[PDB]
């Protein structure tokens, strides 16, 4: 199981058009409580959110830490029956941890330890964004700006549709 589930809820990513974004949650926000449920880990957050929805709560208070103050925001409780979520995720830096042999990324010489800065002239801060851009590639070549030991390198590669994942794949795994 991923180790963030037992870690504190420090926001690394805010999904676009998500409840989280609408009410102004930012990366760096530390979620500490929701309604009457203490949130010490990502797992607590997940469980509280599901509990509230199933008990029929529509709106509740979300308690954040931001620059050492508590912020109180009213949020719509996501509808778990529709699979709806809050729209936050922990930080995963776009750093390559693994490269599948034979893959498009392997072929163009991407190596573990590379930092992906930019996809198709669009700066990215997280692995989710890389994934998003690959999903949206339409199987057409994508350009990546990479940082390797402080040096800027340009790469261009074509995503393959992968039957296991049901979507485009370039062959990169993030560092944990």
């Amino acid at each position: 199981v991923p180790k963030y589930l037992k870690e504190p809820v420090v926001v690394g990513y805010v999904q676009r058009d998500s409840i989280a974004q609408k009410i102004g949650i930012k990366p760096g926000d530390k979620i500490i409580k929701i309604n009457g449920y203490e949130v010490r880990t990502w797992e607590d957050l997940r469980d509280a959110l599901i509990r509230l929805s199933l008990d029929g709560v529509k709106e509740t208070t979300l308690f954040l830490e931001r620059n050492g103050e508590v912020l109180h925001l009213t949020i719509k409780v996501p509808n778990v029956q529709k699979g709806e979520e809050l729209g936050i995720a922990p930080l995963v830096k776009p750093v390559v941890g693994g490269v599948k042999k034979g893959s498009p990324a392997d072929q163009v010489g991407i190596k573990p330890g590379d930092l992906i800065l930019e996809v198709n002239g669009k700066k990215i801060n997280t692995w989710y964004e890389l994934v998003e851009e690959v999903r949206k590639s339409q199987g057409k070549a994508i350009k990546l700006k990479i940082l390797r030991n402080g040096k800027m390198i340009e790469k261009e590669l074509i995503p393959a549709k992968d039957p296991k994942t049901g979507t485009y794949f370039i062959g990169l795994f993030p560092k944990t």
């Epitope: 991923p2 995963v92 692995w127 549709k161 049901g166 979507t167 795994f173």
Partner: antibody, heavy 123, light 112 residues
Amino acid sequence: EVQLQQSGAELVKPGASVKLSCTASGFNIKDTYLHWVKQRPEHGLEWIGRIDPANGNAKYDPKFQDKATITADTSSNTAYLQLNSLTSEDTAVYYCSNRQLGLRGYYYAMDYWGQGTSVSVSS
Amino acid sequence: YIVLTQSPVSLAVSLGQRATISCRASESVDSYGDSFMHWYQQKPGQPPKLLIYLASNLESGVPARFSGSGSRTDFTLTIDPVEADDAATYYCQQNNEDPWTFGGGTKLEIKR
């Protein structure tokens, strides 16, 4: 919102063929695969096959390779399942489906099913 | 092809208590540090619904009382506590290798 909408129930006679359809909303089939699953009355689930709508490449379970034919139309966002040379073992509910998954480091699941299409093979 | 043998075939669990369903694969289903094995719930007259994917990950909205564990050839779905809504047939499914296969199903009865 994502939907897979399947055509209505079919009564067909043995020996013949039928064509079932699945129409997708809220996503482009061209970016993924559509799958077909068979479920006979009182039985479990059996994977028939998938198609890549971008290149018409369809893959089957060898057992269905010749009794099922899967096609897709990207302009109308629709996948089809053709069953030929129908026997009574072909009588079942047929499901179209899509799944997409994020891996270690970025886990997510997109999983959608049509409501199923009942096919009765009878004289 | 990968045979998936699911056990038990049927069971009756009291509201509040633990359900355990196992899936055995004829060959491994791991690749690059993930197991390509998933669990579905199928209610009567409804399409399957994903619960757990890649052995251990909860689908959006699925309660934590559902968990999946295992790797390689040996996998378990745990339902603890079981609730009224869990009355259904459960299936493991693998897609590490073509063709995709389902287990035979496990029918869960709820004791009330």
